[PDB]
Every structure is written in C-alpha cells, then in structure tokens.
Coordinates of C-alpha atoms in Angstrom, one line a residue:
Chain A
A54 CA 81.8 4.9 -41.5
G55 CA 81.6 5.9 -45.2
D56 CA 79.8 5.5 -48.5
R57 CA 78.8 9.2 -48.6
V58 CA 79.7 12.7 -47.7
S59 CA 77.2 15.5 -47.6
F60 CA 78.6 19.0 -47.2
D61 CA 76.7 22.3 -47.2
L62 CA 77.1 25.8 -48.7
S63 CA 75.7 28.7 -46.8
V64 CA 74.1 31.6 -48.8
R65 CA 75.3 35.0 -47.8
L66 CA 73.0 37.1 -45.6
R67 CA 71.6 39.8 -47.9
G68 CA 69.1 42.0 -46.1
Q69 CA 68.4 45.6 -45.5
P70 CA 70.0 46.6 -42.2
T71 CA 68.1 48.6 -39.6
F72 CA 69.3 52.2 -39.3
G73 CA 68.5 54.8 -36.7
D74 CA 67.6 52.9 -33.5
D75 CA 64.7 50.8 -34.5
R76 CA 63.9 47.3 -33.0
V77 CA 65.4 44.2 -34.5
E78 CA 64.1 41.5 -32.1
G79 CA 61.6 40.4 -34.8
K80 CA 63.4 40.8 -38.1
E81 CA 65.9 38.0 -37.6
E82 CA 67.7 37.0 -40.8
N83 CA 67.4 33.2 -41.4
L84 CA 70.3 31.0 -42.5
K85 CA 69.8 28.9 -45.6
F86 CA 71.9 26.0 -46.8
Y87 CA 72.4 24.1 -50.0
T88 CA 73.7 20.6 -50.1
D89 CA 75.1 17.9 -52.4
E90 CA 76.3 14.3 -52.1
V91 CA 79.7 12.7 -52.6
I92 CA 79.8 8.9 -53.0
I93 CA 83.0 6.9 -52.7
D94 CA 83.9 3.5 -54.1
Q95 CA 87.4 1.9 -54.2
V96 CA 89.6 1.5 -57.2
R97 CA 92.2 -1.2 -57.1
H98 CA 94.9 -2.6 -59.5
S99 CA 97.5 -5.4 -59.2
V100 CA 100.9 -5.4 -60.7
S101 CA 102.7 -8.8 -60.7
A102 CA 106.4 -9.4 -60.4
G103 CA 107.3 -12.6 -62.2
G104 CA 108.1 -16.0 -61.0
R105 CA 111.4 -16.9 -59.2
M106 CA 112.9 -17.8 -62.6
Chain B
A2 CA 56.6 34.1 -65.5
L3 CA 57.3 34.9 -61.8
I4 CA 57.7 38.5 -60.7
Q5 CA 59.6 37.7 -57.6
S6 CA 59.2 40.3 -54.9
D7 CA 61.8 41.7 -52.4
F8 CA 60.5 39.5 -49.6
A9 CA 60.8 36.2 -51.5
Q10 CA 64.4 36.8 -52.7
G11 CA 65.5 37.4 -49.1
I12 CA 66.4 41.0 -49.6
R13 CA 63.9 42.0 -47.0
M14 CA 63.2 39.6 -44.1
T15 CA 59.8 38.9 -42.6
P16 CA 59.1 39.2 -38.8
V17 CA 58.5 36.3 -36.4
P18 CA 56.7 36.7 -33.1
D19 CA 58.9 35.9 -30.1
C20 CA 55.9 34.4 -28.3
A21 CA 52.9 32.3 -29.2
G22 CA 49.7 34.3 -29.8
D23 CA 51.4 37.6 -30.8
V24 CA 50.0 38.9 -34.1
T25 CA 52.9 39.9 -36.4
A26 CA 52.2 41.9 -39.5
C27 CA 54.4 43.2 -42.3
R28 CA 53.7 45.0 -45.6
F29 CA 54.4 42.5 -48.4
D30 CA 54.6 45.0 -51.3
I31 CA 56.1 45.3 -54.8
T32 CA 56.7 48.1 -57.3
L33 CA 56.3 46.1 -60.4
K34 CA 57.4 47.9 -63.5
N35 CA 56.6 45.5 -66.4
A36 CA 52.8 45.7 -65.8
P37 CA 50.7 42.6 -64.9
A38 CA 49.6 40.1 -67.4
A39 CA 47.7 36.8 -67.6
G40 CA 49.2 34.1 -65.5
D41 CA 51.9 36.1 -63.7
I42 CA 52.6 34.3 -60.4
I43 CA 53.5 37.3 -58.2
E44 CA 55.3 36.0 -55.1
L45 CA 54.8 38.9 -52.6
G46 CA 55.7 37.5 -49.2
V47 CA 56.3 34.4 -47.1
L48 CA 54.6 32.9 -44.0
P49 CA 57.7 32.7 -41.8
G50 CA 57.2 29.1 -40.7
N51 CA 54.8 27.5 -38.2
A52 CA 52.5 30.5 -38.7
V53 CA 48.8 30.6 -39.6
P54 CA 47.4 33.8 -41.3
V55 CA 44.7 35.4 -39.2
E56 CA 43.8 38.5 -41.1
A57 CA 44.7 39.4 -44.8
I58 CA 44.6 42.9 -46.3
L59 CA 45.3 44.0 -49.8
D60 CA 46.3 47.5 -50.7
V61 CA 46.4 47.5 -54.5
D62 CA 46.4 50.7 -56.5
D63 CA 44.3 51.2 -59.6
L64 CA 46.0 48.4 -61.4
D65 CA 43.7 48.3 -64.5
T66 CA 42.7 51.7 -66.0
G67 CA 39.8 51.5 -68.5
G68 CA 36.2 50.7 -68.9
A69 CA 34.8 47.5 -67.4
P70 CA 38.2 46.0 -66.2
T71 CA 38.3 42.3 -65.9
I72 CA 41.4 42.0 -63.7
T73 CA 41.3 39.5 -60.8
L74 CA 43.8 38.7 -58.0
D75 CA 43.7 35.5 -56.0
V76 CA 46.5 35.3 -53.4
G77 CA 47.4 31.9 -52.1
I78 CA 50.1 29.7 -50.6
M79 CA 52.6 28.6 -53.2
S80 CA 53.9 25.0 -53.4
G81 CA 57.7 24.9 -53.5
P82 CA 60.2 26.5 -51.2
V83 CA 60.9 30.2 -50.7
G84 CA 63.0 32.1 -53.2
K85 CA 63.3 29.4 -55.9
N86 CA 62.6 31.0 -59.3
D87 CA 60.8 28.0 -60.8
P88 CA 58.0 28.8 -63.3
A89 CA 56.6 25.3 -62.6
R90 CA 55.5 26.5 -59.1
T91 CA 51.8 26.8 -58.6
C92 CA 49.6 29.0 -56.5
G93 CA 46.3 28.1 -55.0
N94 CA 43.3 30.3 -54.2
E95 CA 43.1 29.6 -50.4
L96 CA 43.5 33.0 -48.8
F97 CA 41.6 35.1 -51.5
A98 CA 39.1 34.0 -54.1
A99 CA 39.3 36.3 -57.1
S100 CA 39.2 39.8 -55.5
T101 CA 38.1 42.6 -57.9
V102 CA 39.9 45.4 -56.1
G103 CA 42.5 45.6 -58.8
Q104 CA 39.8 47.1 -61.1
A105 CA 39.7 50.3 -59.1
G106 CA 41.9 50.1 -56.1
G107 CA 41.0 50.4 -52.4
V108 CA 41.5 47.8 -49.7
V109 CA 39.9 44.4 -49.3
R110 CA 39.8 42.2 -46.2
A111 CA 39.7 38.4 -46.1
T112 CA 36.3 37.0 -46.7
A113 CA 36.8 33.4 -47.8
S114 CA 36.2 30.7 -45.1
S115 CA 39.6 29.2 -45.9
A116 CA 41.4 32.4 -45.0
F117 CA 41.8 31.4 -41.3
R118 CA 42.0 27.6 -41.8
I119 CA 45.5 27.5 -43.2
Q120 CA 47.5 24.6 -41.7
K121 CA 51.0 25.2 -40.5
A122 CA 54.1 23.6 -41.9
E123 CA 57.7 23.4 -40.6
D124 CA 59.4 25.2 -43.4
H125 CA 58.7 28.6 -44.9
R126 CA 55.9 28.9 -47.5
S127 CA 55.5 31.8 -49.9
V128 CA 52.2 33.7 -50.4
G129 CA 51.8 34.6 -54.0
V130 CA 49.4 36.7 -56.2
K131 CA 48.3 35.2 -59.5
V132 CA 46.6 37.5 -62.0
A133 CA 44.2 34.8 -63.2
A134 CA 42.5 37.1 -65.7
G135 CA 44.5 39.1 -68.2
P136 CA 43.3 42.7 -67.7
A137 CA 43.1 45.5 -70.1
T138 CA 46.2 47.6 -70.7
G139 CA 47.5 48.1 -67.2
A140 CA 49.7 50.9 -66.0
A141 CA 53.3 50.0 -65.4
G142 CA 55.1 51.0 -62.2
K143 CA 52.1 50.2 -60.1
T144 CA 52.3 48.9 -56.5
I145 CA 50.6 45.9 -54.9
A146 CA 50.6 45.2 -51.2
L147 CA 49.3 42.3 -49.1
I148 CA 49.4 43.0 -45.4
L149 CA 49.2 39.7 -43.6
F150 CA 48.5 39.1 -39.9
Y151 CA 50.0 35.8 -39.0
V152 CA 50.2 34.2 -35.5
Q153 CA 52.8 31.6 -34.7
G154 CA 52.6 28.6 -32.3
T155 CA 48.9 27.9 -32.9
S156 CA 47.3 24.7 -31.6
Chain C
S107 CA 81.1 -3.4 -47.7
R108 CA 82.9 -3.1 -44.4
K109 CA 83.5 0.6 -45.0
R110 CA 79.8 1.2 -45.6
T111 CA 78.9 -0.2 -42.1
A112 CA 79.9 0.8 -38.6
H113 CA 79.9 -2.7 -37.3
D114 CA 82.8 -5.1 -37.3
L115 CA 81.6 -7.8 -39.7
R116 CA 84.4 -10.2 -38.8
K117 CA 83.5 -10.5 -35.2
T118 CA 79.8 -10.8 -35.9
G119 CA 80.5 -13.4 -38.5
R120 CA 82.5 -15.5 -36.1
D121 CA 79.7 -15.1 -33.5
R122 CA 77.0 -16.0 -35.9
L123 CA 79.0 -19.0 -37.0
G124 CA 79.3 -20.3 -33.5
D125 CA 75.6 -19.7 -33.0
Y126 CA 74.9 -21.7 -36.2
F127 CA 77.0 -24.7 -35.2
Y128 CA 75.4 -24.8 -31.7
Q129 CA 72.0 -24.8 -33.3
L130 CA 73.1 -27.4 -35.9
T131 CA 74.3 -29.8 -33.3
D132 CA 70.9 -29.6 -31.5
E133 CA 69.0 -30.0 -34.7
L134 CA 71.1 -33.0 -35.7
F135 CA 70.4 -34.7 -32.4
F136 CA 66.7 -34.3 -32.7
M137 CA 66.7 -35.4 -36.4
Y138 CA 68.6 -38.6 -35.6
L139 CA 66.6 -39.5 -32.6
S140 CA 63.2 -38.8 -34.3
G141 CA 64.3 -40.8 -37.4
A142 CA 63.0 -38.3 -40.0
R143 CA 63.8 -34.7 -40.9
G144 CA 60.2 -33.7 -40.9
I145 CA 58.9 -30.4 -42.2
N146 CA 60.3 -27.9 -39.7
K147 CA 61.0 -24.6 -41.4
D148 CA 63.4 -23.2 -38.8
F149 CA 65.8 -26.2 -39.2
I150 CA 69.1 -25.5 -40.9
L151 CA 69.3 -28.9 -42.7
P152 CA 67.3 -29.0 -46.0
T153 CA 64.3 -31.2 -46.7
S154 CA 65.2 -34.7 -48.0
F155 CA 68.4 -34.6 -45.9
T156 CA 68.7 -38.2 -44.8
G157 CA 71.8 -38.4 -42.6
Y158 CA 75.4 -37.4 -43.2
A159 CA 78.5 -39.6 -43.2
Chain D
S2 CA 62.4 35.0 -39.9
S3 CA 63.8 32.1 -37.9
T4 CA 66.2 29.4 -39.1
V5 CA 64.5 26.1 -39.7
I6 CA 66.2 22.9 -40.9
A7 CA 62.9 21.0 -41.5
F8 CA 62.4 17.3 -41.3
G9 CA 62.9 16.4 -45.0
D10 CA 65.9 18.5 -45.7
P11 CA 68.9 16.3 -46.5
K12 CA 70.9 18.2 -43.8
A13 CA 69.1 16.1 -41.2
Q14 CA 72.1 14.4 -39.7
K15 CA 71.3 10.7 -39.1
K16 CA 73.4 8.6 -36.6
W17 CA 73.8 4.8 -37.0
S18 CA 73.7 2.8 -33.8
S19 CA 76.7 0.5 -33.3
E20 CA 74.9 -2.0 -31.1
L21 CA 73.7 -5.1 -33.0
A22 CA 70.5 -6.5 -31.6
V23 CA 70.9 -10.2 -32.1
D24 CA 68.4 -13.0 -32.6
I25 CA 69.0 -14.9 -29.3
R26 CA 70.0 -18.5 -29.8
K27 CA 67.3 -21.0 -28.9
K28 CA 68.5 -23.0 -25.9
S29 CA 69.7 -26.4 -27.1
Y30 CA 67.9 -29.1 -25.2
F31 CA 70.7 -31.7 -25.4
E32 CA 73.2 -29.9 -23.1
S33 CA 75.9 -31.6 -21.0
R34 CA 73.4 -33.3 -18.7
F35 CA 72.5 -35.7 -21.5
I36 CA 75.7 -36.1 -23.5
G37 CA 77.8 -38.0 -21.0
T38 CA 80.3 -40.8 -20.8
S39 CA 79.3 -44.2 -19.5
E40 CA 75.9 -46.0 -19.6
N41 CA 73.8 -43.6 -17.4
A42 CA 73.4 -40.9 -20.1
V43 CA 70.7 -40.6 -22.8
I44 CA 73.3 -39.7 -25.4
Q45 CA 76.4 -41.8 -24.8
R46 CA 79.7 -40.3 -25.8
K47 CA 82.2 -42.8 -27.3
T48 CA 85.6 -42.3 -25.7
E49 CA 87.2 -44.0 -28.7
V50 CA 88.2 -42.2 -31.9
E51 CA 89.4 -39.1 -30.1
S52 CA 93.0 -40.3 -29.6
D53 CA 94.5 -42.9 -31.9
Chain E
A2 CA 22.6 22.8 -23.4
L3 CA 26.3 23.7 -22.9
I4 CA 28.8 22.9 -25.7
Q5 CA 32.2 23.1 -24.0
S6 CA 34.8 23.6 -26.6
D7 CA 38.4 22.4 -26.0
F8 CA 39.4 26.0 -25.2
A9 CA 37.1 26.1 -22.1
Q10 CA 37.6 22.7 -20.4
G11 CA 41.3 23.5 -20.2
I12 CA 42.3 20.9 -22.9
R13 CA 43.7 23.7 -25.1
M14 CA 45.1 26.8 -23.4
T15 CA 44.9 30.4 -24.7
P16 CA 47.7 32.8 -25.4
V17 CA 48.1 35.8 -23.1
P18 CA 50.5 38.6 -24.1
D19 CA 53.7 39.3 -22.0
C20 CA 53.6 43.1 -22.5
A21 CA 51.2 46.0 -22.7
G22 CA 49.6 47.0 -26.0
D23 CA 50.7 43.8 -27.6
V24 CA 47.7 42.4 -29.4
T25 CA 47.0 38.7 -29.2
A26 CA 44.7 36.4 -31.2
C27 CA 43.8 32.7 -31.1
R28 CA 41.3 30.8 -33.3
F29 CA 38.7 29.6 -30.9
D30 CA 36.9 26.8 -32.7
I31 CA 34.5 23.9 -32.2
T32 CA 33.7 20.7 -34.0
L33 CA 29.9 20.5 -33.3
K34 CA 29.2 16.8 -33.0
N35 CA 25.5 17.5 -32.9
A36 CA 23.5 20.0 -34.9
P37 CA 22.8 23.5 -33.6
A38 CA 19.4 24.1 -32.0
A39 CA 17.7 27.0 -30.4
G40 CA 18.9 27.8 -26.9
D41 CA 22.3 26.2 -27.2
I42 CA 25.1 28.2 -25.6
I43 CA 28.3 27.2 -27.4
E44 CA 31.1 28.0 -24.9
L45 CA 34.0 28.3 -27.4
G46 CA 36.7 30.6 -26.1
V47 CA 38.0 32.3 -23.0
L48 CA 39.2 35.9 -22.7
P49 CA 42.0 36.2 -20.2
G50 CA 41.9 38.6 -17.3
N51 CA 42.9 42.3 -17.7
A52 CA 42.3 42.0 -21.4
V53 CA 39.8 43.8 -23.6
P54 CA 38.6 42.8 -27.1
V55 CA 40.0 45.0 -29.9
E56 CA 38.7 43.3 -33.1
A57 CA 36.9 40.0 -33.6
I58 CA 36.4 38.0 -36.8
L59 CA 33.6 35.4 -36.4
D60 CA 34.1 32.7 -39.0
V61 CA 31.6 29.8 -39.3
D62 CA 30.8 27.1 -41.8
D63 CA 27.5 26.7 -43.6
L64 CA 25.1 26.1 -40.8
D65 CA 21.9 25.9 -42.8
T66 CA 20.6 23.3 -45.2
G67 CA 17.4 24.6 -46.8
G68 CA 16.2 27.7 -48.3
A69 CA 15.2 30.9 -46.4
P70 CA 17.7 30.3 -43.6
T71 CA 17.1 32.1 -40.3
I72 CA 19.9 31.0 -37.9
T73 CA 21.4 33.9 -36.0
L74 CA 24.4 33.9 -33.7
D75 CA 25.2 36.4 -30.9
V76 CA 28.5 36.6 -29.1
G77 CA 28.9 37.9 -25.5
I78 CA 31.0 37.8 -22.4
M79 CA 29.5 34.9 -20.4
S80 CA 29.1 35.6 -16.7
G81 CA 30.1 32.4 -15.0
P82 CA 33.6 31.1 -14.1
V83 CA 35.5 29.2 -16.8
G84 CA 34.3 25.7 -17.5
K85 CA 31.5 25.6 -14.9
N86 CA 29.2 23.3 -17.0
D87 CA 26.1 24.8 -15.6
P88 CA 22.9 25.7 -17.6
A89 CA 22.3 28.8 -15.4
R90 CA 24.9 30.7 -17.5
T91 CA 23.5 33.8 -19.2
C92 CA 25.7 34.8 -22.1
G93 CA 25.0 38.0 -24.0
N94 CA 25.5 40.0 -27.2
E95 CA 28.3 42.4 -26.3
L96 CA 30.4 41.3 -29.3
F97 CA 27.9 40.4 -32.0
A98 CA 24.3 41.6 -32.2
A99 CA 22.5 38.6 -33.7
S100 CA 24.9 38.2 -36.7
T101 CA 23.3 36.9 -39.9
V102 CA 26.3 34.7 -40.6
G103 CA 25.6 31.0 -40.6
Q104 CA 23.0 31.2 -43.3
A105 CA 26.1 30.9 -45.6
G106 CA 29.6 30.0 -44.6
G107 CA 31.3 33.3 -44.4
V108 CA 33.4 35.8 -42.5
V109 CA 32.1 38.7 -40.4
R110 CA 34.0 41.3 -38.5
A111 CA 32.9 43.2 -35.4
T112 CA 30.6 45.8 -36.9
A113 CA 29.1 46.9 -33.5
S114 CA 30.2 49.9 -31.4
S115 CA 29.9 47.8 -28.2
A116 CA 32.3 45.0 -29.2
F117 CA 35.3 47.4 -29.1
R118 CA 34.3 49.0 -25.7
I119 CA 34.3 46.2 -23.1
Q120 CA 35.5 46.7 -19.6
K121 CA 38.1 44.4 -18.0
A122 CA 38.0 42.1 -15.0
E123 CA 40.8 40.5 -13.2
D124 CA 39.3 37.0 -13.6
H125 CA 39.0 34.8 -16.7
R126 CA 35.8 35.1 -18.7
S127 CA 34.5 32.8 -21.4
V128 CA 33.4 34.1 -24.8
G129 CA 30.6 32.0 -26.2
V130 CA 28.3 32.2 -29.2
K131 CA 24.6 31.6 -28.6
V132 CA 22.1 30.5 -31.3
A133 CA 19.5 33.1 -30.6
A134 CA 17.0 32.2 -33.3
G135 CA 16.6 28.6 -34.2
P136 CA 18.2 27.4 -37.4
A137 CA 16.1 26.5 -40.4
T138 CA 15.3 22.8 -40.7
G139 CA 18.7 21.1 -41.4
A140 CA 22.2 21.2 -40.0
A141 CA 25.2 19.0 -39.6
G142 CA 28.7 18.8 -38.0
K143 CA 30.3 22.1 -38.8
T144 CA 33.1 24.2 -37.3
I145 CA 32.2 27.5 -35.6
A146 CA 35.3 29.7 -35.2
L147 CA 35.9 33.0 -33.5
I148 CA 39.3 34.8 -33.5
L149 CA 39.5 37.4 -30.9
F150 CA 42.2 40.2 -31.1
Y151 CA 42.4 41.1 -27.4
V152 CA 45.1 43.2 -25.7
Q153 CA 46.2 43.2 -22.1
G154 CA 47.1 46.1 -19.9
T155 CA 44.8 48.9 -21.2
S156 CA 43.6 51.8 -19.1

C-alpha cells in the first residue's frame, strides 16, 4: 500500500493515584492519542552517459 | 477566557459505571482564585461518554458579595473535545438556565425540562459553567461545585 | 499510482483489454450485419463510424 | 473514564479490500456456433489469408 | 384507556442493579400520540422485583394549551402484572399525590412522605401516571417522563 502514514502520540497518564485502600473499579484513567499525517511522493532524476563515441 | 478545572485537564478522572443503569456521581469542583467575570467559560467536569445526566446539583458558595447581586450561572454541554484550551469553544444553557444561587450560595437542583433530555454521544463532552452576567466585585478563592448524576448505557 | 493502490494494475489492465476486444468483436459483427452503427450508447465504436479497413 | 476511539477520529483504521468486483462481460452472441468454416455457418470464416 | 409505553410491552427493558444498595435510574418516557384525557392510565415504567423507590423526578412537557390549567397527574404502583393491557387495572398515588406539574413543562421531585416508603414484592410491578383531573381544553403530542431512582436488596 502507501500514499500515507498516520502515527500516534500517546499523552502521559496524569491523574491523582488512589491511596489507602479505596476502590478503583470506577476511576479508570482513559488513554488519549494525537495524530498526524505523512504523505509520500517519489523523486526521480536521470543521469546520462554519452553516446558510444 | 477559560478557567479550566482539574477534571477537564485530566488531572482528576471521572467515574464510569461498570453496568447500565448504575447512577454514578462525582463532585466537579474548582477553587478559582482570579474571581469570576463576565463571559468566563468555566469548564468544571465532563460527561464520561455514552452518559446522560439524570440529576444535576450545584454547590456554589457566596460568589457575589454585595447588595442586589446580578450574577448568573448557566451550566451546559460544551462543543469541542475535552481538555482543549480553545477560547472559541461555546457553552449552551441546556442543563441549567440562569441559576441565581451564586448571589447568596446554597444548593440548586435541576429544574429545566432539558436537564434530563440530553442525547448521548460516543466521545467525551465537557460540562461548563458560563458566568453570563458580570457580577459585582466577587471574592477570589471561592469554590464552585456541580454534582452530576449521570447514567450510562441508556436507550 | 500503483503504490497508492493495493491492486495489481498490470493484471487488471490485461484482463480489461481482453474483455474489451471480446466485446468489440461482438459489436463489430452486429454493426456490419445491421448495416448502420445506430445510436447504442454502450457500443465502443463512436457514432458516425462507418466501417474500418 | 473509559477509553473511546470514536467514529470520526482519524485513528479509525480503514482496510482496503483487495478483491476487484468486475463488470461482467456481456455474453457475445456470435460465438463459435456461428463463426464456422464451410457453407453451413451464418458467419463464414475464410480459410485464406491466414497462411501465405 | 391504557397507554402502554415501550417500557411495559417489553420493547425496551429496564436496568436492574447487580448488587445491594446500588441505586439505579432509567428515564421512563412516552410519546403520547393522542392527547391526555380524564381517566387515562399511562403505563410508563416498570419497577423490578425486590426493589423500592428511593427518589423520583417526574418530568413532563407542557400538557396544557389554554389559561387556568387544571391537569393533575398522580403516580402509583399499578396492581396488575406487567403489560396486561386490561382496563380493570387500578393504579394509585403512592409516588405523587396529584402533582400540579403539566400546567407548565417543568420538573418535580418526590415531595411526599409515602413515595420513599414503599414495600417490595418479588414480582415486577408497573409504575404508571394517571390523569386524575381532566386537562383544560387543549393538548397535543408531548413526552411524559419519570426517572425512578430505585434500589434492590433493602431490608
């Protein structure tokens, strides 16, 4: 395939931790991602050795 | 001029029920120190996803000290994503419609007919307070709290 | 262009060309027998085409 | 909360099918049963001008 | 004279908690195709077995059209089995004692001392509003809603 690449950056999990034996089945830290786009197109050039003479 | 809370920045996560029909509530609060002003979109907390608010409670302090205060607070569901410091973001008046509890304090419960008719969406939305009327000189370091009851997996 | 697509355009080009020539032979037979190209819009040959060779 | 990728987020990976649905050729009417050598054939093939 | 909402026919099911003390709420609602008239028993929601009401917001749209409105709604635990479709059903006023909401689209909470003290039965019961007093001349298609914070496994 091709024409594009889309890679992601994951933000670090900042969040107040739960001390002293509370419950954490509810307060579940959610992952967030940022993305961008990379587009590719070929670049070509042509050197030319001369004629047989 | 957004005054972005702790819950919006992600520094304090919001609960989600592990089942449908469980009512999950958390205290969306701030200790704002620059004092409120006209047109400050205060982003308290976030609906955690496919969740519909089912009971809304404010717990503001005496946020405008003086004679005949004109302060108003209309919470609502903000437009853009969570935790994006964009002044262009707007806040509607769905959940509350110009509560006057900032004048003296106390607690107000949801009374608008649109409080319980919020439609769910697949990505987190943020509930924000807008001080639509610039109050008299308001004390700094005053707390604002919006205790939401939201139920997930509605029909 | 071939990078931007998962398909192998050479094979499908050859297959479509074979398809096209099969269809062209059939078309050409009906046009010669009927004596006029007509108005058919699915025909390969253009309007006003009056015979080859 | 709970992690959600959402529908419109450009992280929604999209897979391209490799099978090419093709417009099926219309069955040519003048098949081998018509184009035949010798007189008894609606379309007569001329055996000349293949060799030579 | 029975208006069977989607939550009673079985088209939409109701959430039941998977624990004890875990509150549960679901927005029981109707889209009244006709207009309310005296004697109608709008079967809107079902209260699951072994559950007792703990708090109940009744939220309705504007059910009147003219001045001096007189429509009154009372909410009770209807006697019959769920989805019977039988006019012999009785209804009652255990939850709301002829609430004055409906004269203007608004929000009312359980202000009675009998709504919070309801016994439990091991079989499903249907919660249904009844139009006790006939509405003033004029009505249209509006949504009657009733969220019901019930909890299972009390004692």
